[PDB]
Write a protein that binds this ligand. Structure first.
Ligand code: VCA
Length: 133
């Protein structure tokens, strides 16, 4: 299952191409300006086979709970209602969100003890690096 090295609290330390990623999602300018300033913490926890990913920031908080391989309904930070799934691939925790015939992926992987989130929508690739805190 998911590595126990994911469990705990993570702080954003770098974000590359997030504005274009949000644009691809249809997020408007005022929201993007606050999203570009946000430096969230992400808390990953697990109870039995249920994994929770909680994001906290001044602007927006989110939380998802899921079992690997089991599709669920999600509310995203920008207020999309998606059909989502999280699965593993080579230890990467990979999320897909679907809605209105569109798709985005967020792949969260451990790299030298950091957590790297690769976020893809259309041709846009955004990379967000987190330190464990
Ligand atoms: C919730 C805190 C960050 C987002 C703040 C701006 C709010 C809405 C715009 C849409 C953002 C959707 C992506 C959120 C980030 C996913 C990748 C990650 O966990 O780093």
């Amino acid at each position: 299952g998911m590595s126990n090295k994911f469990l705990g609290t993570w702080k954003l330390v770098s974000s590359e191409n997030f504005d274009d990623y949000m644009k691809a999602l249809g997020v408007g300018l005022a929201t993007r300006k606050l999203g570009n300033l946000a430096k969230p913490t992400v808390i990953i926890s697990k109870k039995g086979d249920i994994i929770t990913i909680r994001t906290e920031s001044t602007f927006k908080n989110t939380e998802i709970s899921f079992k690997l391989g089991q599709e669920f309904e999600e509310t995203t930070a920008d207020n999309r209602k998606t059909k989502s799934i999280v699965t593993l691939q080579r230890g990467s925790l990979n999320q897909v969100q679907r809605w209105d015939g569109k798709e985005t992926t967020i792949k969260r992987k451990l790299v030298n003890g950091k957590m790297v989130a690769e976020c893809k929508m259309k041709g846009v690739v955004c990379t967000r690096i987190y330190e464990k805190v």
